[PDB]
Nucleic acid binder design. Structure first.
Ligand code: ZN
Ligand code: ZN
Lengths: 530, 530
DNA sequence: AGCGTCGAGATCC
DNA sequence: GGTATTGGATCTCGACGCTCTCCC
DNA sequence: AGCGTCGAGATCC
DNA sequence: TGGATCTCGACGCTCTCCC
C-alpha cells in the first residue's frame, strides 16, 4: 500500500522475538529479501499479498509468525503434495503441524478436530484444501470455536493467484475463500504467490473480501546465477557431445537439469547421455507416476547426476545444489525460462543457466502455442532475448518484469556483460530478396516454410522456388537464420499457421511492415559482432 | 452503433432472408431484434446478442446458414443444448449434425467427409470448445472447408462462459479465439441469455475480436402477470391456497411450482397429490429416467403441475405454461426472472405468483453463505418482495439496468392494479427497542435468532432476553417480520452466521448503520398503505 | 452443539 | 380470633426431536 | 503440405 | 555401350507441453 521499505526494521516489540525464532527454530542467520517486511506486516495484523519467486522462502513468512503467535495458523493449499512438502520440512524442524485432505482417515480428522478445539494443543499449523472450507460444516464449526477461543488468529492462502481466471492456474474452490475474512475478521490474512499481476492480485483481493492489502513484490534477481545463450548446433550428435563436454568438464559430479521441448526430446537426450556414460534420467508427463517419483528420488539422492526434463518437472523442486540448468530448447516465454532456470543455485552459491538457441525451435514452439492468445507474443519476447548480443540478461529480465534495474547490478554475471566489440549491419536488401522469393512462391500458389524460404535464399530446394539474381550473403547458416528471425519479430515477415491431420505447421508470409520497403530510403539494421 | 439503424429490409440479402424465413422456418414475423442481428451477421460482421431464454436465439444463426452457401460452425458448451437444436432442425428437415466427446468414430469420419465435401447439404455443425482445442483433425477439416469458401459462419453459444465473473465459466472458451485468428473472413455471432458489461468485455477479449456490435433485447415479457403474496405461516393452509389456485383459475392448465429445497418439493408434491392434483417432483437427486419421465408427462399434460427445485430449467420449451408459483422466493433477481419466464412462452397471458415468507430469507441466506455476493442478491430479491407501490417491471428494469417506462406494464402486475394510497411510517423507535434487546443479548453473552428476537420483542421467549419497557406494536406478526426485514436490508440489523455440526445458522446482530441512531433526529421510514 | 417446540410444575387470583 | 382457592389460568422453566439447505 | 532417406535413373567413362 | 553412386522427387504419419 505505502512501501515495503518502511517495514525493513527491527524496532517492533515482537522484532526481538521474531529473531529468536528465526535463528533458533529455523536456524537461519539472516532474513532473505522481503521476509522481514512480510513477517512484520503480518504481526501488525494487516492483510498482506507477497509475490516472491519460487525458492525465495515464501513459507517462512507465515510459518515464523505461527510460533510467534498463540494457537495455530490455518494454511489453504490447493494440492496435497505441497502440503506434504511443508509438513516434511516442519517435522524435520520440529514444529507440530498437521494436514486435512479430501480422503484422509476418518479418525485422523477426528484427532484434528479435537486438536483444533483443544486448549493447550501443540499443533501449530493446519494445512487444508479449499473444499474443506467450502463443503465441511464440521471443520468450519471447529474453526469458529477455535477463533472464539483466540487459538486461531492467522490465515495463509497459498497460490492466491488461483482466484483469478487470468492467472495461469484457476481453482473454482477459491471463490469460496472470502468466507474466511468474513467469518474471522480478527484473523490476519496473508496471500502467497510466485507469479501474479496487478489484475490477478486485485481479483484475488476481491474474492478474498479484503479491504486494504499491502502488496510486496520481491526482486527477480538471483545474483549467483550466470546467464548465457549459445548457438544450438545443427547436428544433434554434436550437440549431445557438447553437453557431455560441459558435464564431464565444468560440472563433473554436480547435479543438474536439462530442460527439453518435447517428451521425445527428453527421452532421446537421456538415451544419448546414458550411452555416453552420464547418469541421466528422463522426466515428462507421459511417464508413470512411479517412474516419475523414482527419477526424482534418484536425482535428489545424487544417484542420477542429470535430470532431462520437460516442464512437467517442477513438483516441489527444492534441490539446493543444482549447479547447472541447460535448455536444450528455448522456453516458450520469459516467465517459463525464468522459472526453469531459477531451479539452479537455490543454495545461493554460483550456478550456470545455459540456453541453446535454434532457428527451428521458434516454429516448433509457435505451432505449439497457437491456441494461446498471447503465445506468439511471449514466444517472440523469448526470441528477442535470444537474439540479443549486447544487452545484459538481467536488464532484459528486468524489462520483462517491469522492474527497476541498475545497469551495473549484473556485475559480471551474464555472458553479454563479460564481452564495443559489436557493430551494425544493414540488412534491407536481404529483406527485399526474401520478399521477392515469397512473391514468386505465392504466384505459383506455394506456401513456404522457413526451411523452404532459407533454402531458396541459399539456392537449394525446389528449383521453381528460386529467384533469379537472389544470392545469399557469404555467412554461416545461423546468421541467415538470425536475420530471418529478426525480420519475423520485426513484422516484415509474419507466421501463417496451417492445421493438418497430425500436426500444426508454420509458414512465413509477407508481413505488415513490408510495404515500408517501397521507399528506398528505408533501412533495417541488426547488430552483429565485429 | 445502435441496432435500430439495422432495422431495415432494403439490403440485398433482405429478400433472401424473408423468403427463407417464411418458407423454411414457416414463421411470418420476427421477434424483436432478430432481423437486426441477422442483418449485421449477414453483413459479415461479428455481433453479440444478449436475449432471454425462449426468445428465439438459435434462429438468428440458423437462418443465415441456409441463406449462405456451405455450413455454419456452432460452439455449444453442453451436449443437451445441442440435442435440443438438432431435434428442432431435423423436424424442419434442415441437415445439422453434432460432434461430441463420445461420438461414434464413424460418425466422426462421416462428419469430416461432409466438411470436406464440396456439395454437402450439411448446414450446421455443433461442436464443444474442446473439439476446437484438442482435435487436430477437426481443425484441419475446418481449415480445408474455410479455404474452399464453404465455411464462413461461426456461432458461439453462451459467450458469457468466457468470463470467470460470468454466471457459468468454462476454461475451454479461452481457446476459442483461434477461430477469429484462423478464419478472420468468417463472421462470428455470440449468443447469450445473461451477460454484464464485464462479461461481454471479457468474452470479446477472449475471442480476440477488437470490433463488436452489441444488441441487447428487452427483459420485458408483456404477457406475464407478476404478483407477490404473503407466504402463510401454516403449511397446510399454504397447500390449500395452492389447491384453490390450481383447481380454480388454472383448472387444466400446466404449471410450475418452484421450491427452495428438494424435500420441500417432495412434501409439496405429496400434499398436492393427496388433494387430487396430478403433480410431479423434480430435483437433481432424481434418477435420469425419472427426470425424463416427469418432463414427458408434464409436456403431454398428463401431469398438471411440476414441483421443482432450480434443477428444472433444462431446455424448457413448453409454450402453454399458464402459471409459475414460487413456494419460496428465489435466491436472486436473476434466478426469479429466469424461473418465472418459463410461463407464457406462447405469448398468451400467464401468471407469476410469488410467496414471500420471513423465514425463507434466512433459509436462503444460510444456503448462499459461501457465495461472495449471495447475501446481496438475496437482499435485492427481498427488497422486491417488500415493495407495495412500485411496478414490478420497474424493479426488474432496475436490476437489468434497462431504460423503462412506468406505464408500459399496463395493469400487468399486482402493484399497478391497486391504483396516494400509501404513506410513510416512522419505525425508528422499534429499531431502538430491537437494538436494546440485541445489546442485552450480547452483554449476557447470548446469541439471538430472528425468532428469538421477535419473541423478546413480543414479551414472550426467555425472560432473561427481554428488555424492560420494550413493548411490541399491536400488529400482525407479518408486520413485525417486515419491519425486521426492512431493518436488515437497511443494515441497521445484520446477519451473523454461525457454523455448527449439521447446519449453518443465522443470528441477528447490531448492524453497521445502527450508530446512525445516535442522532436523535434520525428517522427510519417504511412505506405502508392507508 | 443448538433451535424450536411443548408439557409439568410451580406460582397467582 | 383472624384469612385464606378438590380450580383455572398463566408463566416459566426444563427436557426433547431435527439438523442434513441449489447447481453443475 | 512437409523433411528425410531411399530407390530410380541417368549420363559419363 | 553396360551400370556407378549422388542428385533429385514421393509421400508416411507427422511432431506439441502441461496446465
Ligand atoms: Zn549482465
Ligand atoms: Zn406494473
Amino acid at each position: 500500500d505505502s512501501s515495503p521499505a518502511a517495514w525493513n526494521k527491527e524496532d517492533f516489540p515482537w522484532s526481538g522475538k521474531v529473531k529468536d525464532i528465526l535463528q533458533n527454530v529455523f536456524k537461519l542467520e539472516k532474513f532473505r529479501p522481503l521476509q522481514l517486511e512480510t513477517i512484520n506486516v503480518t504481526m501488525a495484523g494487516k492483510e498482506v499479498f507477497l509475490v516472491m519467486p519460487t525458492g525465495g522462502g515464501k513459507s517462512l513468512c507465515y510459518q515464523l509468525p505461527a510460533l510467534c503467535s498463540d494457537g495455530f495458523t490455518l494454511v489453504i493449499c490447493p494440492l496435497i503434495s505441497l502440503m506434504e512438502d511443508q509438513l516434511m520440512v516442519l517435522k524435520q524442524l520440529g514444529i507440530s503441524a498437521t494436514m486435512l485432505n479430501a480422503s484422509s482417515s476418518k479418525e485422523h480428522v477426528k484427532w484434528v478436530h479435537a486438536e483444533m478445539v483443544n486448549k493447550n494443543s501443540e499443533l501449530k499449523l493446519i494445512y487444508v484444501t479449499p473444499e474443506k472450507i467450502a463443503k465441511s460444516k464440521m471443520f468450519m464449526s471447529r474453526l469458529e470455536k477455535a477463533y472464539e477461543a483466540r487459538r486461531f488468529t492467522r490465515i495463509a492462502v497459498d497460490e492466491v493467484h488461483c482466484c483469478s481466471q487470468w492467472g495461469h492456474d484457476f481453482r473454482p474452490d477459491y471463490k469460496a475463500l472470502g468466507i474466511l475474512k468474513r467469518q474471522f475478521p480478527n484473523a490476519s490474512l496473508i496471500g502467497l504467490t510466485a507469479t501474479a499481476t496487478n489484475h490477478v492480485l486485485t481479483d484475488a483481493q476481491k474474492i478474498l473480501c479484503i479491504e486494504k492489502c499491502f502488496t510486496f513484490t520481491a526482486s527477480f534477481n538471483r545474483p549467483n546465477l550466470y546467464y548465457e545463450v549459445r548457438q544450438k548446433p545443427s547436428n544433434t550428435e554434436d550437440f549431445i557431445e557438447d553437453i557431455v563436454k560441459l558435464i564431464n568438464g565444468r560440472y563433473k559430479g554436480q547435479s543438474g537439469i536439462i530442460y527439453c521441448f518435447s517428451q521425445k526430446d527428453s527421452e532421446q537426450v537421456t538415451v544419448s547421455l546414458q550411452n555416453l556414460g552420464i547418469h541421466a534420467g528422463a522426466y515428462h508427463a507421459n511417464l508413470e507416476p512411479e517412474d516419475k517419483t523414482t527419477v526424482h528420488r534418484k536425482w535428489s539422492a545424487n544417484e542420477i547426476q542429470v535430470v532431462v526434463a520437460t516442464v512437467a518437472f517442477g513438483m516441489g523442486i527444492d534441490k539446493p545444489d543444482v549447479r547447472f540448468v541447460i535448455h536444450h530448447s528455448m522456453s516458450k516465454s520469459m516467465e517459463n525460462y525464468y522459472q526453469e532456470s531459477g531451479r539452479a543455485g537455490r543454495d545461493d552459491m554460483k550456478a550456470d543457466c545455459i540456453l541453446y538457441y535454434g532457428f527451428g525451435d521458434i516454429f516448433r514452439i509457435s505451432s505449439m502455442v497457437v491456441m494461446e492468445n498471447v503465445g506468439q507474443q511471449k514466444l517472440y519476447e523469448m526470441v528477442s532475448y535470444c537474439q540479443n548480443i549486447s544487452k545484459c540478461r538481467r536488464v532484459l529480465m528486468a524489462q520483462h518484469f517491469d522492474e527497476v534495474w541498475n545497469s551495473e547490478a549484473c556485475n559480471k554475471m551474464c555472458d553479454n556483460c563479460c564481452k564495443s566489440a559489436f557493430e551494425r549491419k544493414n540488412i534491407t536488401e536481404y529483406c527485399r530478396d526474401l520478399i521477392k522469393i515469397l512473391k514468386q512462391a505465392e504466384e505459383l500458389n506455394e506456401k513456404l516454410t522457413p526451411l523452404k524460404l532459407i533454402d531458396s535464399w541459399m539456392g537449394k530446394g525446389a528449383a521453381k522456388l528460386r529467384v533469379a539474381g537472389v544470392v545469399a550473403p557469404t555467412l554461416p547458416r545461423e546468421d541467415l537464420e538470425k536475420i530471418i528471425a529478426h525480420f519475423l519479430i520485426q513484422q516484415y515477415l509474419k507466421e501463417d499457421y496451417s492445421f493438418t491431420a497430425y500436426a500444426t505447421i508454420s509458414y512465413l508470409k509477407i508481413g505488415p511492415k513490408a510495404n515500408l520497403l517501397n521507399n528506398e530510403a528505408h533501412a533495417i539494421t541488426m547488430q552483429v559482432t565485429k
